[PDB]
Predict the structure of Spike glycoprotein,Fibritin.
Amino acid sequence: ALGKLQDVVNHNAQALNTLVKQLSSKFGAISSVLNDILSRLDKVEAEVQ
Amino acid sequence: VYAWNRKRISNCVADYSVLYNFAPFFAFKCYGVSPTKLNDLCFTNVYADS
Amino acid sequence: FVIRGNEVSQIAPGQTGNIADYNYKLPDDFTGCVIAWNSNKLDSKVGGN
Amino acid sequence: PTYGVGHQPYRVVVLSFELLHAPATVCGPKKSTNLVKNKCVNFNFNGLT
């Protein structure tokens, strides 16, 4: 019955979950993990990634 | 080059700073990694193709 | 100063190695120029310099 | 003298530049013009353009 309120809740939850899932994107870098970039590369190339 | 040699490196401690003493090369050319970082890393296996 | 060729890459900001760590360290915010040239004819000897 | 280029000696000169702040004492071979006021001009003060 309470579709609109549930829709508000669901939209908020979906937006937050999408924000969290975006942290696994590489965006053109070698890795989506900062720790891997910092442990595998020197200062300058790590800064680029 | 058509019959290039492949050697497997496994179950050993690899000091990559001493490679400079074995051949008179000017520098490494590394992809996905930096030479100075190679001593802080671990690998399942290494392959050396010559 | 004088080094060997395979250490020339160490004369640069944000580098690691024997020369960079223990002999000559450039700052990370270095602004300047590096000029390295081969000096085999002047700094080498048959018995070893 | 028989070593490979990676093991041969290299002479290195590093030029470090200090920019802005205190008054400049090292300058390029640039001739100074007159100081024109009250007009829209291009200006070059010690490299600050």
About this structure: Chains D and A do not touch (no CB pair under 8 Å). The beta strands of chain D are 9-16.
